[PDB]
Amino acid sequence: NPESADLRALAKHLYDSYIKSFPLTKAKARAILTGKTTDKSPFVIYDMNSLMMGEDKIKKEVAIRIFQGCQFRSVEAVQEITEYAKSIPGFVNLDLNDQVTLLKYGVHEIIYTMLASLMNKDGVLISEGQGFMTREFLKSLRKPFGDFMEPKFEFAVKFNALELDDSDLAIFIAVIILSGDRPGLLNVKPIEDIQDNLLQALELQLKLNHPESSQLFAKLLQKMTDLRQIVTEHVQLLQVIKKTETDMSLHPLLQEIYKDL
Amino acid sequence: ESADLRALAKHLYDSYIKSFPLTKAKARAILTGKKSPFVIYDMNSLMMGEDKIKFKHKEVAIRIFQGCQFRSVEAVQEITEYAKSIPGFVNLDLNDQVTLLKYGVHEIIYTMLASLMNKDGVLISEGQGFMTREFLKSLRKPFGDFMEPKFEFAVKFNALELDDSDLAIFIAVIILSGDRPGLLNVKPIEDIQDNLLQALELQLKLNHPESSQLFAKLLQKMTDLRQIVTEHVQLLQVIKKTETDMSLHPLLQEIYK
Ligand SMILES: CCCOc1ccc(C(=O)NS(=O)(=O)Cc2ccccc2)cc1CNC(=O)c1ccc(-c2ncccn2)cc1
Numbered sequence: 352n353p354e355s356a357d358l359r360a361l362a363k364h365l366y367d368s369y370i371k372s373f374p375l376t377k378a379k380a381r382a383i384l385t386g387k388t389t390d391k392s393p394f395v396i397y398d399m400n401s402l403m404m405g406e407d408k409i410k411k412e413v414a415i416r417i418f419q420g421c422q423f424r425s426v427e428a429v430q431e432i433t434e435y436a437k438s439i440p441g442f443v444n445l446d447l448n449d450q451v452t453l454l455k456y457g458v459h460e461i462i463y464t465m466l467a468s469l470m471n472k473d474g475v476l477i478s479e480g481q482g483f484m485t486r487e488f489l490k491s492l493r494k495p496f497g498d499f500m501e502p503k504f505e506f507a508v509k510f511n512a513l514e515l516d517d518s519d520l521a522i523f524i525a526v527i528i529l530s531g532d533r534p535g536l537l538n539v540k541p542i543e544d545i546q547d548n549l550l551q552a553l554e555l556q557l558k559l560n561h562p563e564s565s566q567l568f569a570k571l572l573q574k575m576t577d578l579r580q581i582v583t584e585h586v587q588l589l590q591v592i593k594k595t596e597t598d599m600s601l602h603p604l605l606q607e608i609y610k611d612l
Numbered sequence: 613e614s615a616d617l618r619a620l621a622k623h624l625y626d627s628y629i630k631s632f633p634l635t636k637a638k639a640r641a642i643l644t645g646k647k648s649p650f651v652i653y654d655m656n657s658l659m660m661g662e663d664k665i666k667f668k669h670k671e672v673a674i675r676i677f678q679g680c681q682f683r684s685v686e687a688v689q690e691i692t693e694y695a696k697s698i699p700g701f702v703n704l705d706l707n708d709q710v711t712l713l714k715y716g717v718h719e720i721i722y723t724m725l726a727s728l729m730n731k732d733g734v735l736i737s738e739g740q741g742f743m744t745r746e747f748l749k750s751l752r753k754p755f756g757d758f759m760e761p762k763f764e765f766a767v768k769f770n771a772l773e774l775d776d777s778d779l780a781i782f783i784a785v786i787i788l789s790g791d792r793p794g795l796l797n798v799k800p801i802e803d804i805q806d807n808l809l810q811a812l813e814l815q816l817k818l819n820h821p822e823s824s825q826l827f828a829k830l831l832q833k834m835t836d837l838r839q840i841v842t843e844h845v846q847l848l849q850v851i852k853k854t855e856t857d858m859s860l861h862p863l864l865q866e867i868y869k
Pocket residue numbers: 632633634662667669675676677679680681683684686687690720721724725728735736737738
């Protein structure tokens with residue numbers, strides 16, 4: 352029980368850092384998506400003309416502008432994830448090269464994890480929740496942009512079925528970052544010791560927060576397999592773009608992450 | 613309620629031993645040294661090997677690859693038999709049983725292959741031989757990196773230091789995956805896996821009380837498994853796209869496709 356007390360304190364710490372690092376929480380996202388309120392209602396984009404009026408309501412080629420907007424949020428997300436990673440007990444103490452490595456392979460798995468919070472079966476929240484882009488509008492985009500988002504939705508609806516809240520995700524995200532199996536890690540053992548502590552925290556957290564959810568801990572860990580696959584599909588799709596879209600500029604920070612990924 | 617979980621563990625272990633000849637315990641005793649097997653380290657040792665190994669498994673790199681296919685198909689039947697011993701599996705829809713096996717055998721083959729591997733090589737021909745890791749890397753493209761990704765996984769997987777009692781339940785968990793494409797009734801599959809996951813968790817806590825979060829660390833390996841599988845499929849295509857000297861007997865390729 353004194354051991355469990357330390358785990359709860361770790362859970363509270365991570366959740367607190369989670370709230371402070373990420374602007375759009377899942378709680379706020381679900382409040383917008385369910386449309387229960389009258390002040391948090393998003394403008395919905397489902398075709399070209401709806402997108403046009405969206406430019407005035409929400410603060411080159413259509414498919415390109417959508418992609419460049421996603422690159423912006425992605426880079427901004429890397430900053431937020433990085434800020435959160437620093438708050439993880441023992442992360443900044445690790446070898447400097449391993450810190451870069453853990454973030455390199457970790458950011459996208461987390462991005463797609465938190466992207467699911469902004470997603471349902473019909474679409475995804477955009478621009479801090481001000482807008483809502485339908486799943487069909489994205490799927491109808493010009494090739495190969497019309498299938499860049501579909502694999503994310505498929506994972507989202509299955510991941511959201513686990514019904515995790517932000518207190519759960521906070522620890523799960525930390526578990527992803529501190530992976531000892533990341534390629535190029537100099538000192539793996541100190542990373543595994545931290546993840547071991549994070550896994551204990553996540554286990555107790557899910558058991559207390561979801562007592563009637565049998566093997567939720569196991570089910571959650573298995574979802575990390577789905578994350579890797581989506582990240583893998585994403586990189587391959589990007590290599591197709593850079594050859595067909597030679598005039599489209601990719602962000603240097605992202606390219607450094609994609610480099611030998 | 614833990615009486616049922618221990619009963620499941622013992623049941624799966626017994627079927628595991630029966631369905632699979634060369635266990636990890638046997639493979640470990642062979643590798644370490646504790647009746648030594650023939651060692652294949654280069655081209656000449658390979659020739660003398662097949663002259664004395666007596667294998668049912670023209671070019672050297674191709675004959676090795678085809679040899680692996682023969683053993684894989686043998687393993688598929690051993691896995692299939694074991695899968696039918698898992699409580700509730702045979703009661704599932706027949707189409708789902710086929711689906712679970714079709715997408716599950718590859719993950720299981722590479723899981724149990726780690727039991728036959730160390731950092732230096734891999735046991736072949738049910739423990740009769742031993743092909744070094746370096747000789748496998750020396751094979752010309754693209755065969756030179758068809759076994760190497762499996763070694764890298766085996767090193768990380770064997771570090772968990774699981775035994776046959778652990779693996780028996782773990783294999784069952786892999787088979788009962790509810791996310792296999794084309795499944796018609798996912799509920800009873802995930803219900804069985806849920807029970808298997810509980811059995812595995814209790815098994816690892818009792819057999820390895822000093823290994824903290826071993827259960828979680830094992831589930832994370834599922835990621836590496838599927839990575840290897842998809843990577844293996846992509847390599848298979850390269851073999852099919854190029855390579856003329858892969859064409860076997862018309863009736864032979866049917867058996868091992
Ligand atoms: C892609 C995977 C590689 O192939 C394999 C597939 C399954 C297994 C395996 O052991 N799976 S298993 O799950 O442990 C079940 C089993 C155990 C023992 C015998 C048969 C089945 C091992 C290998 C390992 N390779 C061999 O055993 C092997 C390799 C080369 C030759 C060979 N033969 C003649 C000439 C050259 N090479 C023969 C066997």
